[PDB]
Design a protein around this ligand. Structure first.
Ligand SMILES: [Mg+2]
Ligand SMILES: [Mg+2]
Ligand SMILES: [Mg+2]
Ligand SMILES: [Mg+2]
Ligand SMILES: [Mg+2]
Ligand SMILES: [Mg+2]
Ligand SMILES: [Mg+2]
Ligand SMILES: [Mg+2]
Ligand SMILES: [Mg+2]
Ligand SMILES: [Mg+2]
Ligand SMILES: [Mg+2]
Ligand SMILES: [Mg+2]
Ligand SMILES: [Mg+2]
Ligand SMILES: [Mg+2]
Ligand SMILES: [Mg+2]
Ligand SMILES: [Mg+2]
Ligand SMILES: [Mg+2]
Ligand SMILES: [Mg+2]
Ligand SMILES: [Mg+2]
Ligand SMILES: [Mg+2]
Ligand SMILES: [Mg+2]
Ligand SMILES: [Mg+2]
Ligand SMILES: [Mg+2]
Ligand SMILES: [Mg+2]
Ligand SMILES: [Mg+2]
Ligand SMILES: [Mg+2]
Ligand SMILES: [Mg+2]
Ligand SMILES: [Mg+2]
Ligand SMILES: [Mg+2]
Ligand SMILES: [Mg+2]
Ligand SMILES: [Mg+2]
Ligand SMILES: [Mg+2]
Ligand SMILES: [Mg+2]
Ligand SMILES: [Mg+2]
Lengths: 52, 233, 121, 252
RNA sequence: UUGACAUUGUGAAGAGACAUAGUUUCUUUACUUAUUCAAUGAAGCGGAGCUGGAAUUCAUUUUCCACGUUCUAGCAUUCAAGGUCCCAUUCGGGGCUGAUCCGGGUU
RNA sequence: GCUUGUGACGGCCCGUGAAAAUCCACAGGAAGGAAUAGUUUUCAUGCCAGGUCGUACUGAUAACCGCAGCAGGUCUCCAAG
RNA sequence: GAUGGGGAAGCUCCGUUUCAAAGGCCUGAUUUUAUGCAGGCCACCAUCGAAAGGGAAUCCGGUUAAGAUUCCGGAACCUGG
């Protein structure tokens, strides 16, 4: 592999020659939702604290 | 403000890597460090017999400072001062015909353990300083008793090195005065009194008091609190 | 005041000053001369019938050469001793405890010529 | 005579463990600040056969609280745990198969595995396939917890000692007859050199107490004293009874 | 394997005698520094304090708990962004705070 | 067809069938970089160098071990009709 | 199988990361100058052990009495610079 040009060792996506693409779809979706649900989680317990 | 943001980190178990902190309380010291520290601890956990326990009581930093101030006027000759004196007599005496008495009677601090002991036994010392480090303590432990029975006023003082500096050695274990200029007789009488009040007078009472027996501080806590609730409900 | 602050709980051996040697006397009086000059490197021509042939046909000088010498030392030696240019040097150890160097000269030189200048045949 | 087989085992020359294919030692996490004040999460990444062992292991990975990286751990997998599952370890963790909690935080009746004999020893009790220990009571003053081991014994240990909820996987492995010599062969081939087994009653006297005689037979009581001596202890050592056990065993 | 002696110290209660002052000796049960065992790239121990509140006030707090993470097989690192004070305003860079105080007993 | 290679599968296990050097990749974004001219050697082409020791042959009814040119013993690859 | 260590009268036995103050890389700081300090890491703590295991890279044709994937001819490839 050292004897061979960089384009033989990647595909041009995030996580190119490392994870498998359907795998990166999953990573992205899950990241987005979980980062969203975080705002959802916070605002509930900000509400619990003031309604108690 | 600008295009700059607040993003406060959360260091509360299960997220964010803990930041760098002062772990000095936790470092795994070299054995020689661990050993010299434990030598201290072990030396306090035990009940320490009165005749060793009477050290630890040391001249207070005021009386001390005053006592080094006096003793410092009586430093022994320096190499040069003596090279100076010899030629000032070796020439002069041998010729103008003094009796090896074209030199003045020297006044100095007397030192060396063996020296001072003989001085004390002959009631020549007027004031003796005993260091409080002295690791074979035996070199020195008999000296409060010694001075006391010989009626000689003494003081346990911080600094073997400090006794050293006043005598041009690295250390010195003891320092004493047998002689004094008249301009100083009075300063000394006063010093001896504060000192005699703090040691020789107290000696017979100190002889009855074991030291040590001190818990470490996690065990103090444990007991200052166990014995807070137990009784006083 | 107050103590240092160590953020590592590991205590490592202090980085300490390493003086260089400044001897009070010399290690050995006189340095040894060159243990392997060219004359000790290339010891004697090898002139077997079949060595001779390599010379006439392959522009190759064949030398018995020091056991202690490598392809570099043989090359340099031949060069310096013979005013000649070496393409490449092959070597083998003989079954009598000695080293043979097949030394190919470059095409500017004529090993045959250059062997009966050194004086053999 | 000569040194008998059970004495030669101790120098373990040809008697050491066959260890090459082993996954590594199975252990709980080191008992740190996380596990002992809160809980810490990992993921089971892999559950995997360990040669010589019955129960599968579970490879579980956690973030390092003090450095940016992943630190992997080798658990014994409890029946039910799975890849992708989140595993929670700590005092303030919650009672789920797979999590690891100190016995003080789990109610009487809880079922656990791989429990520590002292806190932090990273696990000692009930590891073999199918085994487990039941919590049967607590003594909150001097925090101890009383448990019952696979063997039947009850024992009390520190309420800080940790355990992992559930039973060890691979159960019933021993319900199945080996059938042939060869399956025992491959069984002990991955353990240690203890198989097959010559009866001492088939050896000569030089070899063993049981050795010799013109008929095979032990010729003296085969129940040997505790205070017998190396070279003497073959047979039923320190046996307090002997013969076919009649009627319900069951520790009372 | 079993006993004695030595390693072996400190308390407290109870027995044991000059024959109902405590020198002393045994039994119990406390202590930790000797000795002993585990752990860890000795990392968060012990003691106090801030806030939340259960709690019921017999003057006001007498206390006891807590005191950042659990739908998800992501991401978590550059003394931390933020705040604030300096260097003499250059790029760079430093302190404090963010992350409470005290004791250096690694647990 | 025969020998060998290889693939996608399938049977088996209380057996589930090494390790390390080494090579690459990705996440990261410290940094370093242009218009009067910078960045680029994981693209092409071009220059130099690569030491040391082994290397013959036998490998067996005569080159090995059995006192020997011993009907014995001694690991393996190629394989036509 | 050395080493801090622990046994042993001792030849030596134990241990191998062990109860040790165990070491070196990347560049910056130099423009007295050659390399002192300034950061930050990394704490991995010997070494021997395979000519069948792992492993950077070569082929064809010709050539000798006896060498050849090693010489000659041609044509490649790898590693370092
Ligand atoms: Mg590609
Ligand atoms: Mg003077
Ligand atoms: Mg010609
Ligand atoms: Mg060669
Ligand atoms: Mg082993
Ligand atoms: Mg066998
Ligand atoms: Mg049998
Ligand atoms: Mg049997
Ligand atoms: Mg028989
Ligand atoms: Mg017998
Ligand atoms: Mg018998
Ligand atoms: Mg018999
Ligand atoms: Mg029988
Ligand atoms: Mg006893
Ligand atoms: Mg620790
Ligand atoms: Mg075949
Ligand atoms: Mg398989
Ligand atoms: Mg790759
Ligand atoms: Mg910078
Ligand atoms: Mg290139
Ligand atoms: Mg080299
Ligand atoms: Mg050959
Ligand atoms: Mg033959
Ligand atoms: Mg034969
Ligand atoms: Mg050894
Ligand atoms: Mg090797
Ligand atoms: Mg090899
Ligand atoms: Mg090989
Ligand atoms: Mg050929
Ligand atoms: Mg030839
Ligand atoms: Mg041949
Ligand atoms: Mg060629
Ligand atoms: Mg060419
Ligand atoms: Mg190159």
């Amino acid at each position: 592999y050292a004897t061979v040009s960089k384009t033989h060792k990647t595909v041009s996506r995030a996580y190119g020659g490392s994870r498998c693409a359907n795998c990166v779809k999953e990573r992205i979706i899950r990241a987005f939702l979980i980062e969203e649900q975080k705002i959802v989680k916070k605002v509930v317990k900000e509400q619990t604290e003031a309604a108690k | 403000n600008p295009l700059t943001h607040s993003t406060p980190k959360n260091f509360g178990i299960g997220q964010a890597v803990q930041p760098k902190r002062n772990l000095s309380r936790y470092v795994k010291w070299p054995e020689y460090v661990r050993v010299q520290r434990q030598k201290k601890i072990l030396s306090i956990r035990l009940k320490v017999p009165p005749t060793i326990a009477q050290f630890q009581y040391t001249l207070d930093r005021n009386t001390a400072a005053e006592t080094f101030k006096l003793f410092n006027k009586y430093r022994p000759e320096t190499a040069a001062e003596k090279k100076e004196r010899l030629t000032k007599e070796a020439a002069a005496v041998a010729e103008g015909k003094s009796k090896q008495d074209a030199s003045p009677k020297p006044y100095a601090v007397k030192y060396g353990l063996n020296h001072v002991v003989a001085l004390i036994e002959n009631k020549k010392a007027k004031l003796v300083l005993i260091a409080n480090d002295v690791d074979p303590i035996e070199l020195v432990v008999f000296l409060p008793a010694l001075c006391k029975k010989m009626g000689v006023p003494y003081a346990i003082v911080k600094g073997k090195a400090r006794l050293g500096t006043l005598v041009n050695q690295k250390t010195s274990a003891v320092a004493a005065l047998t002689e004094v200029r008249a301009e100083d007789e009075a300063a000394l009488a006063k010093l001896v009194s504060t000192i005699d009040a703090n040691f020789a007078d107290k000696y017979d009472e100190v002889k009855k008091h074991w030291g040590g027996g001190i818990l470490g501080n996690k065990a103090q806590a444990k007991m200052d609190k166990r014995a807070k609730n137990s009784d006083s409900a | 005041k107050a103590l240092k602050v160590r953020t590592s709980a590991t205590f490592r051996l202090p980085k300490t000053l390493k003086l260089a040697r400044a001897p009070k006397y010399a290690s050995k009086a006189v340095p040894h001369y060159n243990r392997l000059d060219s004359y000790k490197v290339i010891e004697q021509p090898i002139t077997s019938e079949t060595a001779m042939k390599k010379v006439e046909d392959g522009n190759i000088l064949v030398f018995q050469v020091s056991m202690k010498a490598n392809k570099y030392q043989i090359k340099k030696a031949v060069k310096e001793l013979y005013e000649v240019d070496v393409l490449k040097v092959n070597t083998l150890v003989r079954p009598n405890g000695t080293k043979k160097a097949y030394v190919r000269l470059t095409a500017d030189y004529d090993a045959l010529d250059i062997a009966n200048r050194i004086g053999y045949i | 005579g000569r040194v008998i087989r059970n004495q030669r085992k101790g120098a373990g020359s040809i008697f050491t463990s066959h260890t090459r294919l082993r996954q590594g030692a199975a252990k709980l996490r080191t008992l740190d600040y996380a596990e002992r004040h809160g809980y810490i999460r990992g993921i089971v990444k892999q559950i995997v056969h360990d040669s010589g062992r019955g129960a599968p292991l579970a490879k579980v990975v956690f973030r390092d609280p003090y450095k940016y990286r992943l630190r992997e751990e080798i658990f014994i997998a409890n029946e039910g745990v799975h890849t992708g599952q989140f595993i929670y370890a700590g005092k303030k963790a919650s009672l789920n198969v797979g999590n690891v909690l100190p016995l003080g935080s789990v109610p009487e009746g809880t079922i656990v595995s791989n429990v520590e004999e002292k806190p932090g020893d990273r696990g000692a009790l009930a590891r073999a396939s199918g085994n487990y220990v039941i919590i049967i009571g607590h003594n909150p003053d001097e925090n101890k917890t009383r448990v019952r081991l696979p063997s039947g014994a009850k024992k009390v240990i520190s309420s800080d000692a940790r355990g992992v909820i559930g039973v060890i996987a691979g159960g019933g492995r021993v319900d199945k007859p080996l059938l042939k010599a060869g399956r025992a062969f491959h069984k002990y081939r991955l353990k240690r050199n203890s198989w097959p087994k010559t009866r001492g009653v088939a050896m000569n006297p030089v070899d063993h107490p049981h050795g010799g005689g013109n008929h095979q037979h032990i010729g003296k009581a085969s129940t040997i004293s505790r205070g017998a001596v190396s070279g003497q202890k073959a047979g039923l050592i320190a046996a307090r009874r002997t013969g076919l056990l009649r009627g319900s065993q069951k520790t009372q």
